[PDB]
Symmetry: D2
Subunit: 233 residues, 4 copies
């Protein structure tokens, strides 16, 4: 039912559903089988940053994920998002653990959407999330804590990522991400994250996603479905 | 019930409830009887611009309303808004006609809210409103048209401001307008408007306002209550 | 000597040096023979808008030029600008008339450059230029007038574009347009222009360009060299 | 000769020239004897943040300096800066040691200037300074290092603040800080700093300042003159 576009930070290779056999970042257009991926060295316990960039001129959706040591992974995909997304969307962040697990801590998240004609703009920046974050819609296991973080997946009292968890935070306001009369419709989103695991292998990752506004966590979408898709089609 | 802070562009002098005997801009803190006003020459049928500026450092809320010929009216009031507003608010625009009437056309509206610590930010800009504006909450008579305008009060098919009308548009997302740990909590809001009247005297004006998030149009708040207050206390 | 990257709004087809046989927008990398162009219907006497967008992730430089009736022309080119431009640049606007002529009036110009690490940012917006614009470097025939415009090419007292004219306005501050440790280095530039001609055919166009900081108008670079190149190589 | 407006972070009480007998932040209008000050607990070796905020509506210039533990000091002064500053200015940061000394390390500096009519804007952000910072004008002892810092006063190879030092960094581009037709002319500037001393008492402080564009370090303006004034008048 939901239309999803997403950038996934995919920590766990689900080879039987498309993933490459490494941790990877992915552009996902209406399917968890990414249209495009890049090998990504997730750095356990380090604070990472994702940048997602799209404009309707170049019609190239790009993401880059880096860490402070400067290793960074980048992915791009040429796609006309006007053809994919409804005019109004919500934007958000999504995370999963499955059998294997990890902290899916967002430390900051920012987003800018513009429509420039022949301008409407939405921008939010969160560098600190709060306990009762009234412009965020939390779903599933996502919590904002007093440590100023967005914890997208269940952590246990004593600091531990719980498995089978799925959580999302959508910004409260619909965003008008395209308008057929706009000459430029662009969006940028940036988030920093801390994936930490003690697990044999971390899983399952974090995605920034854009969806129809009424979007919600799909049924059994934990683990490899990254809280975005009802299935692996 | 609602806590209101507002800048009013008050086209019609309701002297029996505080107004001065001229059209005026006003800062309103929890009462339609402005704490501070300035004589304002509303220019009939011309596009005007309001700017509202507040920061928690100076703790001075200011507005200036100007037109293109450069006549402008300005008002300031020293007030600690942390003491007035709940932490989370909605922001919006409100308009009224009563016995006398006017177009209450908003052509653009922009808003920036920041919390800077020892940053969270929301910014929206509308330069064009659309028929189905999913990040706006319209109340009462407010409509967004295909002419890209926000028509806060009922206009009649043939271009005429109807009386007894009250309408508001709140931005969809709550805004976090103060946070006791922020060192600067500031907001700016800007809107352009076109008040046009054929009436013996225009009424009643436009306000930018900030309220509790669940705020709605008070009972019988048309005319001089500018769609903000249940009474004239 | 100068390294140029530019988006040209090329009103006059110089077929013997690469142009297509129509008015065109072009991406120019170190040569006036554009790497990529798109047919552009210049609308005589109408206010146009150019948007130039680049980020080091997608590594796609794009421009779109539109007018209010919504006709718009778009061009994109995949290029790694880190390989082309020195780290510090100036940004600007350039215009030419030759044998044929036109007003090369810039009504507004804005620019945003960011370096985001694993942020530095410059943004300027001019919606009104002034007589003595101390953050602009004017070259050749470019003048800022009291009408708030940037007139890149000589106009005659009585409203007429003079021929053989070349003029540029560079923003005063060097911009740091790439930094090998930045994970995103992006820039956007936007300008509105009014090309007006009574001439048999308008010429020669407007470019937004990025150059080494000490860049100046090349010798005899009027007409088809758009004030950017010493020759047509 | 120079016209200065400044916010001083004054670490050393020069009581014989106006200072209070504590470390203080100060608003300085054309004189080092601040028009207004507030006791400021400089936290030795900690990273501090200054915010300076002015708009021509409220006509209140404010600064707040805080540290991470949240102690913050605030100062405001009602002043019409149109009456004080020339239309075009440069903006910058200034520091001094005298007999007593301190590191005057700027870790980031940002500035936004707007003119809104009846908009021109300049914004720069430096979160990382570089060795050869081509949009900064360094004066006296100010150096940008490879550690990404702006070191306004001489530090010695082995980490030590040298005395008698004075250094400033002005942004390269003049800023148009007022325009008599603007209805709002506002500016915000933000900088983080690290003042560290081993000295019996730290001195002399950091100022953000705005000056005529050709401004330079006054003769013998080390120590208590904070690199802004030729004398203590
Ligand atoms: O449901 C099995 C899935 O759970 C994840 O945590 C594992 O890594 C695997 O993708
Ligand atoms: O209800 C009477 C009120 O209606 C307004 O339109 C008049 O100007 C007056 O304030
Ligand atoms: O120098 C000849 C050139 O001058 C331009 O104005 C003409 O259109 C042609 O490109
Ligand atoms: O020149 C004497 C001054 O030098 C400063 O470092 C001292 O604190 C005092 O203000
Ligand atoms: Ca996977
Ligand atoms: Ca009234
Ligand atoms: Ca040509
Ligand atoms: Ca002192
Ligand atoms: Mn995947
Ligand atoms: Mn009133
Ligand atoms: Mn060409
Ligand atoms: Mn002092």
């Amino acid at each position: 039912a939901d239309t999803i576009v997403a950038v996934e930070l995919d920590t766990y290779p689900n080879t039987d559903i498309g993933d490459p056999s490494y941790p990877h970042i992915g552009i996902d257009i209406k399917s968890v089988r990414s249209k495009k991926t890049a090998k990504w060295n997730m750095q356990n316990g380090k604070v990472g940053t994702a940048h997602i960039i799209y404009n309707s001129v170049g019609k190239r959706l790009s993401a880059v994920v880096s860490y402070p040591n400067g290793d960074s992974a980048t992915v791009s995909y040429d796609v006309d998002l006007d053809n994919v997304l409804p005019e109004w969307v919500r934007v958000g962040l999504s995370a999963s653990t499955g059998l294997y697990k990890e902290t899916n801590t967002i430390l900051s998240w920012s987003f800018t959407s513009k429509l420039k004609s022949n301008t409407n703009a939405l921008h939010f920046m969160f560098n600190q999330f709060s306990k009762d974050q009234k412009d965020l819609i939390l779903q599933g296991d996502a919590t904002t804590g007093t440590e100023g973080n967005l914890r997208l997946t269940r952590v246990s009292s004593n600091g531990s990522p719980q498995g089978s968890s799925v959580g999302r935070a959508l910004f409260y306001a619909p965003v008008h991400i395209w308008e057929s009369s706009a000459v430029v419709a662009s969006f940028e989103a940036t988030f920093t994250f801390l994936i930490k695991s003690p697990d044999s292998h971390p899983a399952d990752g974090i995605a920034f996603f854009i969806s129809n506004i009424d979007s919600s966590i799909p049924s059994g979408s934990t683990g490899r479905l990254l809280g975005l898709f009802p299935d692996a089609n």
